[PDB]
Amino acid sequence: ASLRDIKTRINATKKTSQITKAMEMVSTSKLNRAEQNAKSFVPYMEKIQEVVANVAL
Amino acid sequence: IVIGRVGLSFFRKRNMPVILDITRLPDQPSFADIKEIARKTVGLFADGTFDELYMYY
Amino acid sequence: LDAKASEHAARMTAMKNATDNANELIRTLTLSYNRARQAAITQEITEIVAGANAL
Amino acid sequence: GKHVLVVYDDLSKQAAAYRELSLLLRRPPGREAYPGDIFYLHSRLLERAAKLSDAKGGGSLTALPFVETQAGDISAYIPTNVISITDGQIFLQSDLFFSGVRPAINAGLSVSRVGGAAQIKAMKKVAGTLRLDLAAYRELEAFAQFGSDLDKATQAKLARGARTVEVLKQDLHQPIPVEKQVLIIYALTRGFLDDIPVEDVRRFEKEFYLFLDQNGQHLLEHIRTTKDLPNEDDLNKAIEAFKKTFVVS
Amino acid sequence: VAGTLRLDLAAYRELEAFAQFGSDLDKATQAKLARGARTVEVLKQDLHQPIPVEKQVLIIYALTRGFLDDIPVEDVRRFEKEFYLFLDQNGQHLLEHIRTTKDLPNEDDLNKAIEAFKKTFVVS
Amino acid sequence: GLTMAEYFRDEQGQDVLLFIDNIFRFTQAGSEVSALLGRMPSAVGYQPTLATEMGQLQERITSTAKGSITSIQAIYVPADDYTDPAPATTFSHLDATTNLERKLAEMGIYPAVDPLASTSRALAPEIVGEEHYQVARKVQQTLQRYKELQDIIAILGMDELSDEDKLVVHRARRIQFFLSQNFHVAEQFTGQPGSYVPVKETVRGFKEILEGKYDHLPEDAFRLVGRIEEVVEKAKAMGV
């Protein structure tokens, strides 16, 4: 290819790389928060599971 | 019953019936976010409209 | 909750894979660019010298 | 006082031969070893095609030079020089060729600087709508393949645009008369092909040509005698009559 | 003050991709972006309007020490112009101290001048 | 041609309009004769005296106390390469610059003037007015900001964007289409007669668009209109 075409390809790929890196860095924090939410849900699930397993029979 | 736009579009591209759906949700939903949809899903079994429920995720 | 956690983990993994692919492509394109630049310089100077010594 | 058409089959070969003889005569080389007057050579050649005035007899000469590129690099020396001389260019692309579009004219890049002044009234009337219908379809997908969402009007832009691509296809050594061209482009641009499937557009076109040959002779005669479109209602009725008997599959 | 200005600008030149992403509240990067935008707004200058070094030092000090944080980005240049107009009216002693000793004035007096001007300034 | 114009400039004190066609051909012919004149080649095959000849030609086209010559020159850029020596050397002699882009030409926008690459030293607040300067700078900044958003949109779609850059792009499309105009000489190409727009109405229309007075109008109504009433008329004729 020609120098100008290669340079344009490099610039476009660099912009795409930066966008994807930003998205990954956001998603890591979102996953970390979702894990804490799932952890918080646990005790209600435990108590309701126990009470249902008792009463429903 | 579909949650999310992608599955809704996938099923509507084909010719499978969809009864209920919710599309836009917070990244960290709280207890009251999908209360109506869950209650309606239970009610559809309550009024004999459904025989059984399977969930995939 | 598991669905949301899986969605965020999947987004993270897909985005890091895309970033790695982009970096590899940038490296290869830079190598090609340098080769083309050297070839262009060589051709230009050879043509100039040939024209100069044709007199 | 006559009219002539001239085809130069490879100006790149002509330029290569000129470079060879110039280097053998020991004249100093230029860019890519070409002589300095390589542009003057082709300008001198191509400026002799002209449309003479009435005082000079009214004769004319038409030229169709050919230039061959390397891997589509239209930025090369000879292609640039020739492009800067002529009154327009037609781009043939291997990408369009292998995708099924034959002939492979790239409509986004092909241009004619004498546009409209070189057409009959009916062609000028229908090609205006055809150009917009093709350009909108191409530019809709130029930005992105699908986009976030598509409107019903956008689905129409994509269906009639695909039907234009189907209509513009053609086979070897089978030229079409201008009246049949304008009739089929009218039938397209007025929306009669929306119900006809994309895979049946070409067969529809062939059987439409046969139908006009058998029954619609008066429309052809009117077009070839007046150079303008016939009555809107009669043509609409003829197209509807053919579409009644056409068989979808 | 030049070192702190350089660090603040270097932190903002990266993380430019993060402008659209994480528009929600973040503990650190939001502050870095907010400081960098104001730094870029401060560094702008009009044609044929040279500024004395004693005023450049004061405006860079005000930016770096955090007195511009509670001011919108659109008001930064007007704040700078009105601060320059306020300086030659009241902080003549600070300006003379800078000119004569080539050193920063007394920190508390400079702070008092800055809050005194900020009280008068009108945020639009 | 320059010799014919200089007589009217000097001996009669007139104002002369010197329309010169492609300057590039003068330099090209100078380079064509260079090798046969016996001179050594230069960087891109041009003659060694390229800049000297270019300056000797251009410096004669000037305004003096006797009279003023204003010249409009078309300049060919070989293969869209703006780093070519002839166009690169021509820049030093110009007061205003208008750049035409194949990207804008293919998209259907004419005259296809690049709104960011074009420059002029007359665009100053003391020359054209503070309101005009504000409007021009705001339009340029909006277009530059919109150009940035396209990179994000091409990957993540329009929906991912916020509600202020949404307005930014929604108004930038309108501005970009309103920069088009229908020419009197383009009537042979389009069948639509051209229009003449005064600068005051141009500024007023662009300011109104920037303020959002016509935000509800459809996007396609702004193509090849002229005045700001004509886009409203087109929108009325095609629905809204």
Short mmCIF file of N, CA and C in Angstrom, two decimals, chain F residues 19-121:
data_model
loop_
_atom_site.label_atom_id
_atom_site.label_comp_id
_atom_site.label_asym_id
_atom_site.label_seq_id
_atom_site.Cartn_x
_atom_site.Cartn_y
_atom_site.Cartn_z
N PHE F 19 -8.76 36.95 -13.18
CA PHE F 19 -9.10 35.54 -13.02
C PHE F 19 -8.06 34.72 -13.77
N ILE F 20 -7.23 33.99 -13.03
CA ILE F 20 -6.20 33.14 -13.62
C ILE F 20 -6.63 31.70 -13.42
N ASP F 21 -6.52 30.91 -14.48
CA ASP F 21 -6.87 29.50 -14.42
C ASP F 21 -5.70 28.78 -13.76
N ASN F 22 -5.63 27.45 -13.90
CA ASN F 22 -4.72 26.62 -13.10
C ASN F 22 -3.30 27.17 -13.15
N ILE F 23 -2.80 27.61 -11.99
CA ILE F 23 -1.41 28.02 -11.86
C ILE F 23 -0.48 26.84 -12.05
N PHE F 24 -0.92 25.64 -11.66
CA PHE F 24 -0.06 24.47 -11.68
C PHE F 24 0.53 24.22 -13.06
N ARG F 25 -0.19 24.60 -14.12
CA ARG F 25 0.29 24.34 -15.48
C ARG F 25 1.52 25.18 -15.81
N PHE F 26 1.60 26.41 -15.29
CA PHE F 26 2.78 27.24 -15.51
C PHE F 26 4.03 26.58 -14.94
N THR F 27 3.95 26.13 -13.69
CA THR F 27 5.06 25.42 -13.07
C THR F 27 5.36 24.12 -13.80
N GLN F 28 4.32 23.42 -14.25
CA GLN F 28 4.51 22.15 -14.95
C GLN F 28 5.28 22.35 -16.25
N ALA F 29 4.93 23.38 -17.01
CA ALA F 29 5.65 23.66 -18.25
C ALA F 29 7.08 24.09 -17.97
N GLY F 30 7.28 24.90 -16.92
CA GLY F 30 8.63 25.24 -16.51
C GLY F 30 9.47 24.02 -16.20
N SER F 31 8.88 23.02 -15.55
CA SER F 31 9.60 21.78 -15.28
C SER F 31 9.79 20.94 -16.54
N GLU F 32 8.84 21.00 -17.48
CA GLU F 32 8.99 20.26 -18.73
C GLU F 32 10.18 20.75 -19.54
N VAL F 33 10.41 22.06 -19.59
CA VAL F 33 11.55 22.56 -20.35
C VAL F 33 12.87 22.47 -19.60
N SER F 34 12.84 22.14 -18.30
CA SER F 34 14.03 22.27 -17.47
C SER F 34 15.12 21.29 -17.88
N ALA F 35 14.77 20.02 -18.07
CA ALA F 35 15.76 19.01 -18.42
C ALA F 35 16.42 19.28 -19.76
N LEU F 36 15.66 19.76 -20.75
CA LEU F 36 16.26 20.08 -22.04
C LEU F 36 17.07 21.36 -21.98
N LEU F 37 16.75 22.27 -21.05
CA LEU F 37 17.60 23.44 -20.88
C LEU F 37 18.96 23.11 -20.29
N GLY F 38 19.16 21.89 -19.80
CA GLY F 38 20.45 21.47 -19.28
C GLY F 38 20.61 21.56 -17.78
N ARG F 39 19.53 21.70 -17.03
CA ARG F 39 19.62 21.90 -15.59
C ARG F 39 19.38 20.59 -14.84
N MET F 40 20.02 20.48 -13.68
CA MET F 40 19.92 19.28 -12.87
C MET F 40 18.52 19.14 -12.28
N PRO F 41 18.07 17.91 -12.03
CA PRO F 41 16.73 17.72 -11.48
C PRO F 41 16.67 18.08 -10.00
N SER F 42 15.44 18.23 -9.51
CA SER F 42 15.16 18.58 -8.13
C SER F 42 14.36 17.47 -7.45
N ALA F 43 13.82 17.77 -6.27
CA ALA F 43 13.30 16.75 -5.37
C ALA F 43 12.25 15.85 -6.04
N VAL F 44 11.23 16.45 -6.65
CA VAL F 44 10.12 15.65 -7.17
C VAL F 44 10.07 15.84 -8.69
N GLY F 45 11.23 16.02 -9.30
CA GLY F 45 11.31 16.21 -10.73
C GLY F 45 11.07 17.63 -11.21
N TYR F 46 10.82 18.57 -10.30
CA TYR F 46 10.60 19.95 -10.69
C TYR F 46 11.93 20.63 -11.02
N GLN F 47 11.83 21.82 -11.61
CA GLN F 47 13.02 22.58 -11.92
C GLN F 47 13.62 23.17 -10.64
N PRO F 48 14.94 23.40 -10.62
CA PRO F 48 15.55 24.02 -9.44
C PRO F 48 15.02 25.42 -9.15
N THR F 49 14.62 26.16 -10.17
CA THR F 49 14.19 27.54 -10.02
C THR F 49 12.69 27.67 -9.78
N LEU F 50 12.06 26.65 -9.20
CA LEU F 50 10.61 26.65 -9.03
C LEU F 50 10.15 27.84 -8.19
N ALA F 51 10.73 28.00 -7.00
CA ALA F 51 10.30 29.07 -6.11
C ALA F 51 10.63 30.45 -6.67
N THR F 52 11.79 30.60 -7.31
CA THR F 52 12.16 31.89 -7.88
C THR F 52 11.21 32.30 -9.00
N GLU F 53 10.90 31.37 -9.91
CA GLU F 53 9.95 31.68 -10.98
C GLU F 53 8.57 31.98 -10.42
N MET F 54 8.13 31.17 -9.44
CA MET F 54 6.81 31.36 -8.85
C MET F 54 6.70 32.74 -8.21
N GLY F 55 7.72 33.14 -7.45
CA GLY F 55 7.71 34.45 -6.83
C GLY F 55 7.79 35.58 -7.83
N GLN F 56 8.63 35.44 -8.86
CA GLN F 56 8.73 36.49 -9.87
C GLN F 56 7.40 36.69 -10.59
N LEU F 57 6.64 35.61 -10.80
CA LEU F 57 5.32 35.77 -11.39
C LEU F 57 4.34 36.39 -10.40
N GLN F 58 4.33 35.91 -9.15
CA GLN F 58 3.26 36.27 -8.23
C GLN F 58 3.42 37.67 -7.66
N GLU F 59 4.65 38.13 -7.44
CA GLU F 59 4.85 39.42 -6.79
C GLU F 59 4.39 40.59 -7.66
N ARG F 60 4.18 40.37 -8.96
CA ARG F 60 3.71 41.45 -9.82
C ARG F 60 2.21 41.68 -9.65
N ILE F 61 1.48 40.70 -9.12
CA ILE F 61 0.05 40.83 -8.89
C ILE F 61 -0.19 41.40 -7.51
N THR F 62 -0.12 42.73 -7.38
CA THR F 62 -0.26 43.40 -6.10
C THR F 62 -1.05 44.69 -6.27
N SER F 63 -1.60 45.16 -5.16
CA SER F 63 -2.26 46.45 -5.14
C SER F 63 -1.28 47.53 -4.71
N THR F 64 -1.29 48.65 -5.43
CA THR F 64 -0.41 49.77 -5.15
C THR F 64 -1.25 51.01 -4.88
N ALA F 65 -0.58 52.16 -4.75
CA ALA F 65 -1.29 53.41 -4.53
C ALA F 65 -2.07 53.84 -5.76
N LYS F 66 -1.55 53.56 -6.96
CA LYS F 66 -2.25 53.91 -8.18
C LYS F 66 -3.56 53.15 -8.33
N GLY F 67 -3.54 51.85 -8.04
CA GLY F 67 -4.73 51.04 -8.22
C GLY F 67 -4.55 49.70 -7.55
N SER F 68 -5.62 48.91 -7.58
CA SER F 68 -5.65 47.61 -6.92
C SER F 68 -6.03 46.52 -7.90
N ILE F 69 -5.26 45.43 -7.88
CA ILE F 69 -5.58 44.22 -8.63
C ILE F 69 -5.93 43.13 -7.63
N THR F 70 -7.12 42.58 -7.76
CA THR F 70 -7.52 41.40 -6.99
C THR F 70 -7.57 40.19 -7.91
N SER F 71 -6.94 39.11 -7.48
CA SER F 71 -6.75 37.93 -8.32
C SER F 71 -7.33 36.71 -7.63
N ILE F 72 -8.08 35.91 -8.39
CA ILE F 72 -8.61 34.64 -7.92
C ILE F 72 -8.00 33.56 -8.80
N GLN F 73 -7.31 32.61 -8.17
CA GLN F 73 -6.49 31.64 -8.88
C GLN F 73 -6.91 30.23 -8.49
N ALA F 74 -7.14 29.39 -9.49
CA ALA F 74 -7.35 27.97 -9.25
C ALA F 74 -6.01 27.25 -9.26
N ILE F 75 -5.83 26.34 -8.31
CA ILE F 75 -4.55 25.64 -8.14
C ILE F 75 -4.83 24.15 -8.07
N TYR F 76 -4.24 23.40 -8.99
CA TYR F 76 -4.40 21.95 -9.00
C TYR F 76 -3.48 21.31 -7.98
N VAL F 77 -4.01 20.35 -7.22
CA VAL F 77 -3.24 19.59 -6.25
C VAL F 77 -3.08 18.17 -6.79
N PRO F 78 -1.88 17.76 -7.20
CA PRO F 78 -1.72 16.45 -7.83
C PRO F 78 -2.02 15.31 -6.86
N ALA F 79 -3.01 14.49 -7.22
CA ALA F 79 -3.36 13.29 -6.46
C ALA F 79 -3.69 13.61 -5.01
N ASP F 80 -4.34 14.75 -4.78
CA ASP F 80 -4.78 15.21 -3.46
C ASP F 80 -3.63 15.35 -2.47
N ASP F 81 -2.39 15.39 -2.95
CA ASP F 81 -1.23 15.48 -2.07
C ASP F 81 -0.88 16.95 -1.87
N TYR F 82 -1.23 17.48 -0.70
CA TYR F 82 -0.97 18.89 -0.41
C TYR F 82 0.48 19.16 -0.07
N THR F 83 1.31 18.13 0.07
CA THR F 83 2.73 18.30 0.31
C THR F 83 3.54 18.40 -0.98
N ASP F 84 2.88 18.39 -2.13
CA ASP F 84 3.58 18.54 -3.39
C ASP F 84 4.25 19.91 -3.45
N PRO F 85 5.46 20.00 -4.01
CA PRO F 85 6.20 21.27 -3.96
C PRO F 85 5.48 22.46 -4.57
N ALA F 86 4.76 22.28 -5.69
CA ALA F 86 4.11 23.44 -6.31
C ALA F 86 2.98 24.00 -5.45
N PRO F 87 1.98 23.21 -5.04
CA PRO F 87 0.97 23.78 -4.12
C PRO F 87 1.57 24.23 -2.80
N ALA F 88 2.59 23.53 -2.30
CA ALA F 88 3.21 23.94 -1.04
C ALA F 88 3.86 25.31 -1.16
N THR F 89 4.51 25.59 -2.29
CA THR F 89 5.12 26.89 -2.52
C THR F 89 4.09 27.97 -2.80
N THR F 90 2.95 27.61 -3.39
CA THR F 90 1.95 28.63 -3.73
C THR F 90 1.30 29.25 -2.49
N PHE F 91 1.31 28.55 -1.36
CA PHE F 91 0.59 29.03 -0.18
C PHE F 91 1.14 30.36 0.33
N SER F 92 2.44 30.60 0.16
CA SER F 92 3.06 31.79 0.74
C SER F 92 2.52 33.09 0.16
N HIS F 93 1.94 33.05 -1.03
CA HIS F 93 1.56 34.26 -1.75
C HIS F 93 0.09 34.64 -1.59
N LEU F 94 -0.70 33.86 -0.86
CA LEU F 94 -2.14 34.02 -0.85
C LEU F 94 -2.62 34.67 0.44
N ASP F 95 -3.66 35.49 0.33
CA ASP F 95 -4.31 36.10 1.48
C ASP F 95 -5.46 35.25 2.00
N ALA F 96 -6.27 34.70 1.10
CA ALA F 96 -7.36 33.81 1.47
C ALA F 96 -7.20 32.49 0.74
N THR F 97 -7.59 31.41 1.41
CA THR F 97 -7.41 30.06 0.89
C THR F 97 -8.72 29.30 0.99
N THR F 98 -9.12 28.66 -0.10
CA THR F 98 -10.32 27.83 -0.15
C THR F 98 -9.92 26.43 -0.58
N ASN F 99 -10.19 25.45 0.27
CA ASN F 99 -9.82 24.06 0.02
C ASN F 99 -11.07 23.24 -0.31
N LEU F 100 -11.00 22.49 -1.40
CA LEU F 100 -12.10 21.63 -1.83
C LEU F 100 -11.75 20.19 -1.52
N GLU F 101 -12.72 19.44 -1.00
CA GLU F 101 -12.49 18.09 -0.50
C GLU F 101 -13.31 17.08 -1.30
N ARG F 102 -12.64 16.01 -1.74
CA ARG F 102 -13.33 14.94 -2.45
C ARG F 102 -14.33 14.23 -1.54
N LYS F 103 -14.05 14.19 -0.23
CA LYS F 103 -15.00 13.59 0.70
C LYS F 103 -16.32 14.34 0.70
N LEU F 104 -16.26 15.67 0.73
CA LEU F 104 -17.48 16.47 0.66
C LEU F 104 -18.12 16.37 -0.72
N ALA F 105 -17.30 16.32 -1.77
CA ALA F 105 -17.85 16.22 -3.12
C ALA F 105 -18.64 14.93 -3.32
N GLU F 106 -18.10 13.81 -2.83
CA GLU F 106 -18.77 12.53 -3.02
C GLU F 106 -20.05 12.44 -2.19
N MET F 107 -20.06 13.06 -1.01
CA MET F 107 -21.24 13.04 -0.15
C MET F 107 -22.41 13.83 -0.74
N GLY F 108 -22.18 14.60 -1.79
CA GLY F 108 -23.24 15.39 -2.40
C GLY F 108 -23.26 16.85 -2.01
N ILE F 109 -22.29 17.30 -1.21
CA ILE F 109 -22.25 18.69 -0.76
C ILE F 109 -21.38 19.49 -1.73
N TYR F 110 -21.97 20.51 -2.34
CA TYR F 110 -21.25 21.47 -3.15
C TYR F 110 -21.46 22.87 -2.58
N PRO F 111 -20.47 23.77 -2.70
CA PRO F 111 -19.20 23.74 -3.43
C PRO F 111 -18.12 22.81 -2.88
N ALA F 112 -18.43 22.06 -1.82
CA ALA F 112 -17.50 21.13 -1.18
C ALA F 112 -16.30 21.84 -0.58
N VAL F 113 -16.47 23.09 -0.15
CA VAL F 113 -15.40 23.81 0.52
C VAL F 113 -15.19 23.21 1.91
N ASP F 114 -13.95 22.91 2.24
CA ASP F 114 -13.65 22.39 3.57
C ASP F 114 -13.83 23.51 4.59
N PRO F 115 -14.73 23.37 5.56
CA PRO F 115 -14.97 24.48 6.50
C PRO F 115 -13.86 24.67 7.51
N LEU F 116 -12.97 23.70 7.69
CA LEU F 116 -11.89 23.82 8.65
C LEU F 116 -10.55 24.16 8.02
N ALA F 117 -10.25 23.61 6.85
CA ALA F 117 -8.96 23.89 6.21
C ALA F 117 -8.92 25.28 5.58
N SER F 118 -10.06 25.82 5.18
CA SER F 118 -10.09 27.13 4.55
C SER F 118 -9.73 28.21 5.56
N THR F 119 -8.91 29.16 5.12
CA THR F 119 -8.42 30.22 5.99
C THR F 119 -8.49 31.55 5.26
N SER F 120 -8.49 32.63 6.05
CA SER F 120 -8.48 33.98 5.50
C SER F 120 -8.05 34.93 6.61
N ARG F 121 -7.12 35.84 6.29
CA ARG F 121 -6.68 36.81 7.28
C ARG F 121 -7.67 37.94 7.47
#
